[PDB]
Amino acid sequence: RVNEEQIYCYCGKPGKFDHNMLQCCKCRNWFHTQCMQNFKKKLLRGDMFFVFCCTVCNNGIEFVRRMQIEWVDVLHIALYNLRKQHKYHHLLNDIWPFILEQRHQLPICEKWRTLPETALMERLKQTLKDYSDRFVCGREFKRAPAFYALRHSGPPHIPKVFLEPHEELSDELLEKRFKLMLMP
Ligand SMILES: [Zn+2]
Ligand SMILES: [Zn+2]
């Protein structure tokens, strides 16, 4: 009755989407990063912000590009990796440190990367408000609210990129068609 059908990589083994797996834009098949050619980077759980095209669809040349991600993406990644932390998460105590730890590693613009901490705090506070649909705000008794959590169980929202088989794989096309930003 309830057997979950697991998708498979071309290697023949199953896998998890939010755990080192990417989907080809052209063929729409899923691949283990290891089962890819020269992809060897540890990936935070939920972080799939890449544009991938396999060797089959791209004339034998594997195509990977890292996306440029916004603060909401960083926050969703933060809350997704933490929570899987025995209800909510204090902004200053649990969310703030983690982003600071990973700021260097995250695919964001230099402005975001080198942004002052006070200006960063207010920017993060507002982002969580603008994205109230994804983030619940929690308040302690007789305390200003400092607690946040994902309103639902899901991983970071990531825009789907599906190309026609005959289309060029230019960064120009990806930005014109899908409104994406790519990390240089
Ligand atoms: Zn493919
Ligand atoms: Zn595989």
UniProtKB/Swiss-Prot annotation:
Organism listed in the record: Drosophila melanogaster (Fruit fly)
Superkingdom classification of source: Eukaryota
Name of the protein this chain belongs to: Polycomb protein Pcl
Coiled-coil stretches: none
Zinc finger extent (PHD-type): 6-54
General function of this protein: Polycomb group (PcG) protein. While PcG proteins are generally required to maintain the transcriptionally repressive state of homeotic genes throughout development, this protein is specifically required during the first 6 hours of embryogenesis to establish the repressed state. Component of the Esc/E(z) complex, which methylates 'Lys-9' and 'Lys-27' residues of histone H3, leading to transcriptional repression of the affected target gene.
Homology family: Belongs to the Polycomblike family.
Compartments (UniProt record): Nucleus; Chromosome
Domain comment (free text): The PHD-type zinc fingers mediate the interaction with E(z).
Assembly mode: Component of a form of the Esc/E(z) complex present specifically during early embryogenesis which is composed of Caf1-55, esc, E(z), Su(z)12, Pcl and HDAC1/Rpd3. This complex is distinct from the PRC1 complex, which contains many other PcG proteins like Pc, Ph, Psc, Su(z)2. The two complexes however cooperate and interact together during the first 3 hours of development to establish PcG silencing. Interacts with corto in vitro.
